[PDB]
């Protein structure tokens, strides 16, 4: 093309403003660009990945640099529980003198406090001085440059990888599993043993003395001799003060279980052992596929041979090998799905099994991290289903996958969708019904008539791991259980202490109130899934539009006929599911925050009793904890929470603005724009200036996207302010 | 002194840079190669 969308003649030859809008949003769909060959596609994608990696490293470099140049890491290291971590400095020419003072509280210059947890992580991993952080930043800047060079290099004529190289699954998997994940873990345990653990005990091991400071007194003698037990002897005493030698030990690899008494975090020795074990597992697993050395498995054969003899699963997995290798969308979907689960797990396990020192005592940071990863997880999950649908519309070959496990899924689509619908209905009616019952009776002044179910099943699981409050004498909660006898001399001692300590988030106590919220979360997952799954299955066709596959993943509609076909494309399913995703994640995050807020405040009872009905959430959570935020700036002054206050209102604006695009549709606006064109052409003086791109209204799908973005941005921003200002304003 | 950098770079990054970038994009999208 000769216009902006060089990759699309259709858009390029467009006489309106759409040319600009669409060109920007269709830029990264390399597969649909004019004149795209598969080889070029892969090559360009590979190079683009190098660029993304570089951006990630530049981002990390910046954090280190700004903390080192404008932060208080060293002071924090000295007094971790009495210093507020600094992120970066503030230079806003719009600030008033008062603001300069407010944001400069506790320091000598205006500054922003970090709620990212970097200080704790770096403290745990070994960083003790600002100069060290600087070196890291410089190194990452260099690595970023190297990655950029690689992107250019592999796009050059003699270094462009072949399409075959891009499809050698065995070699990549072997290498990625054994080297990227396995050896990297081994390297990490090396760092922990050589640098981190020594630092925790007061010894400095850096690039200056690492080659002459043995990690363990015995040496590598025990390792090669086979007497590995030596490395687990003399674990740090329970009276050990972190970052000092008082009460220190010599152990480097142990399975103590539990948390360091003073830092209330997992033992470093245990983490080292953890990564060492994981390393061996992955390195071994990376020797499973054939890679030009004779031995190994061929993935195609494995998939083809797996067909249940009964015939209940049809022809089995035959045909899937080719489908996956020849479809980038399916690959992306599988990846996003797994990463989404991982992100949720990080959030869930990181607040219970605190990994970093003094992180549990920083309430605001702990709250931010959870909400951060949970939201990212939602986006990652939705994307997986989205690309799954794109696959069906674009890359699915009905003939190749004949009676395959995948095809049969599309044969009982109605069954799946219908049953998922029933589940959603059941959960919805009863969950809401029970909440309303509890609200009404309480309102009428009769709280004794509430329907409160104890979460017995969950309580049982907690007891099974050792919790004793519930009084369920089972498994690890039983002294006579075979399980207790097994680990009583291994890891249970430490675990049974933490699990039965009320001041830890390991298996928090649950009650009737938790039962209901969990069932609400269930509703969210099921309903969000219904929308996404339906979109995927009904993406290649439906009774209303039996030829949907010929129109694509995203199209405005199919006309006002046959009853009306608005929002009938698969893209619209993503659009609709996004709202539900936000709602469910919101419920999850609200639950975590309120529960923890009450615990931190010392009144766990408030949640226990007020969480049973809806008014409680509104009055004892949203209304009560909004007081610090809404008073960031008042008719009498301002404080450091002013920025957070302003953002809260800003979020509401964006959210509501989104509604305009969602409820108002194109026809109205197009007609109005026409009148404006008339005016400009008929008004003297302004007539001198004219447009080169005809002014037109936004398209149907465009408006949907714009609206969803406005809704989403406002949603996240408003909650971000609340979770931070409320927690910090009250407990910090 | 490095301390003066915040007051010398921020004006440029938030005002001069964005302007020139937007101008270039306009010239790029309004041109008919």
């Amino acid at each position: 093309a000769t216009k902006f969308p060089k990759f699309s003649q259709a858009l390029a030859q467009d006489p309106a403003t759409r040319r600009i809008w669409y060109g920007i949003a269709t830029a990264h769909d390399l597969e649909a660009h004019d004149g795209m060959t598969e080889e070029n596609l892969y090559q360009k994608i590979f190079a683009s990945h190098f660029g993304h990696l570089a951006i990630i490293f530049l981002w990390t470099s910046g954090n280190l640099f700004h903390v080192a140049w404008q932060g208080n890491f060293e002071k924090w290291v000295s007094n971790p529980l009495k210093t507020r971590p600094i992120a970066h400095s503030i230079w806003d020419p719009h600030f008033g003198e008062s603001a300069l003072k407010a944001f400069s509280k506790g320091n000598t210059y205006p500054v922003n406090i970090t709620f990212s947890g970097l200080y704790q992580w770096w403290y745990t991993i070994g960083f003790r001085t600002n100069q060290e952080l600087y070196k890291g930043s410089i190194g990452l800047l260099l690595l970023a440059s190297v990655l950029l060079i690689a992107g250019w290099l592999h796009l050059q004529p003699k270094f462009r990888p072949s399409l075959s190289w891009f499809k050698n699954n065995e070699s990549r998997l072997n290498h990625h599993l054994s080297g990227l994940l396995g050896f990297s873990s081994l390297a990490w345990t090396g760092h922990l043993v050589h640098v981190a653990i020594p630092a925790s005990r007061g010894v400095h091991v850096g690039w200056d003395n690492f080659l002459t400071t043995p990690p363990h007194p015995a040496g590598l003698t025990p390792f090669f001799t086979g007497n590995w037990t030596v490395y687990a002897e003399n674990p740090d005493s329970a009276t050990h003060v972190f970052n000092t030698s008082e009460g220190s030990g010599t152990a480097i690899l142990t399975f103590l279980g539990g948390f360091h008494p003073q830092t209330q975090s997992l033992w470093l020795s245990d983490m080292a052992h953890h990564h060492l074990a994981i390393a061996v597992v992955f390195i071994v697993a990376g020797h499973m596929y054939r890679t030009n050395f004779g031995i190994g498995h061929n993935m195609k054969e494995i998939l083809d041979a797996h067909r249940p003899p009964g015939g209940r699963l049809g022809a089995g997995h035959v045909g899937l090998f080719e489908t996956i290798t020849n479809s980038l969308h399916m690959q992306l979907g599988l990846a996003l799905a797994c990463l989404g689960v991982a992100t949720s797990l990080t959030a869930q396990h990181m607040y219970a099994l605190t990994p970093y020192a003094y992180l549990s005592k920083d309430f605001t940071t702990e709250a931010a991290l959870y909400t951060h990863h949970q939201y990212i997880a939602g986006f990652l999950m939705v994307g997986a289903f989205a690309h799954g649908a794109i696959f069906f519309v674009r890359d699915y070959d009905p003939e190749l996958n004949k009676n395959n496990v995948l095809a049969r899924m599309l044969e009982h689509k109605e069954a799946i969708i219908s049953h998922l619908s029933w589940a959603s209905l059941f959960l919805g009616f009863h969950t809401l019904g029970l909440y309303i019952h509890n609200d009404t009776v309480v309102a009428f002044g009769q709280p004794e008539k509430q329907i409160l179910f104890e979460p017995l099943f969950a309580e049982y699981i907690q007891a099974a791991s050792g919790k004793a409050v519930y009084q369920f004498n089972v498994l690890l909660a039983s002294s006579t259980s075979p399980a207790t006898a097994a680990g009583n001399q291994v890891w249970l001692p430490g675990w049974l202490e933490a699990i039965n300590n009320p001041k830890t988030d390991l298996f928090l106590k649950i009650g009737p109130g938790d039962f209901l919220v969990h069932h609400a979360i269930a509703l969210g997952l099921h309903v969000t899934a219904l929308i996404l799954v339906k979109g995927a299955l009904d993406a290649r066709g439906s009774k209303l539009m039996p030829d949907k596959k010929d129109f694509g993943y995203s199209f405005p509609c199919d006309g006002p006929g046959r009853g009306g076909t608005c929002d009938i494309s698969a893209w619209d399913a993503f659009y609709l599911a996004m709202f539900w995703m936000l709602n469910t994640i919101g419920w999850v995050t609200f639950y975590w925050h309120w529960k923890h807020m009450t615990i931190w405040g010392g009144n766990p009872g408030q949640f226990d009793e007020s969480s049973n009905y809806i008014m409680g959430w509104l009055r004892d959570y949203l209304w009560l904890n909004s007081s610090p935020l809404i008073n960031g700036y008042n008719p009498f002054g301002m404080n450091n929470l002013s920025v957070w206050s302003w953002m809260f209102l800003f979020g509401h604006l964006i959210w509501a603005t989104g509604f305009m695009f969602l409820i108002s549709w194109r026809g109205y606006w197009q007609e109005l724009i026409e009148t404006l064109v008339w005016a400009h052409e008929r008004t003297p003086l302004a007539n001198l200036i004219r447009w080169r791109d005809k002014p037109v209204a936004l398209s149907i799908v465009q408006a949907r996207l714009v609206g969803l973005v406005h809704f989403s941005v406002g949603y996240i921003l408003t909650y971000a302010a609340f979770v931070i200002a409320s927690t910090s304003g009250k407990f910090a | 002194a490095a301390s003066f950098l915040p007051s010398i770079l921020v004006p440029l990054v938030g005002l001069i840079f964005p302007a020139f970038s937007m101008a270039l994009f306009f010239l790029y999208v309004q041109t008919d190669d």
Binding site: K44, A47, S48, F50, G51, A54, L58, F65, A68, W69, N130, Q131, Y134, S137, I138, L141, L142, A144, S145, L148, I149, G151, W152, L155 | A1, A2, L5
Partner: peptide, 29 residues
């Protein structure tokens, strides 16, 4: 304390990244 020289060195490194970034972008174009 990060010295001025250290800060200036960092800035020089960043510049290299920038010039190498423009090229990658223009090569992908």
């Amino acid at each position: 304390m990060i010295t001025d020289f250290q800060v200036y060195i960092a800035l020089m490194a960043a510049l290299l990244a920038s010039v190498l970034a423009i090229r990658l972008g223009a090569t992908l174009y």
